[PDB]
């Protein structure tokens, strides 16, 4: 929300393409579900490790997931 003087202009922050992204650096260990399988929001779809400490990854939206990176990356 940008206010210029007494007028307001609102800009959208892009989050639309529905692409799953790593929140951090690290390494991919494996994927939890099948490539092409349906996932629901809140379900874990991937397992990554940064910090030598494992952190899963929950899906945001419900849909059919196809993976870009191969396990180990």
């Amino acid at each position: 929300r940008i206010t210029i003087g007494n007028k307001t202009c609102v800009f959208e922050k892009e989050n639309d393409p529905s692409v799953m992204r790593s929140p951090s650096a690290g390494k991919l260990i494996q994927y939890i579900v099948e490539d092409g399988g349906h996932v629901f929001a809140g379900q874990c779809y991937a397992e990554i490790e940064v910090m030598k400490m494992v952190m899963t990854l929950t899906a945001v939206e419900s849909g059919c997931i196809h993976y870009v990176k191969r396990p180990g990356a």
């Binding site: 191969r70 396990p71 180990g72 990356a73």
Partner: protein, 73 residues
């Protein structure tokens, strides 16, 4: 077993990369065809890196077995 040697391995394994590499070896096909073949080779060799990387570490793992330790005493 850095990337250069991994590519050298792929040169004699992957049927797709072999077919493309042999086709590009034909003298004086055409400029456009050579460009297309080169891009196909680049995409195929890049796409196949993670799998041949797992192969490489498997190969190295075969050197760390107890059979070798038993033979060496």
């Amino acid at each position: 077993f850095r990337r250069k040697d991994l590519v050298k391995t792929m040169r004699r394994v992957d049927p797709v990369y072999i077919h493309l590499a042999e086709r590009l070896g034909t003298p004086e096909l055409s400029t456009a065809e050579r460009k297309e073949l080169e891009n196909k080779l680049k995409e195929r060799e890049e796409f196949l890196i993670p799998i041949y990387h797992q192969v490489a570490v498997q190969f190295a793992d075969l050197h760390d077995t107890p059979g070798r330790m038993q033979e060496k005493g």
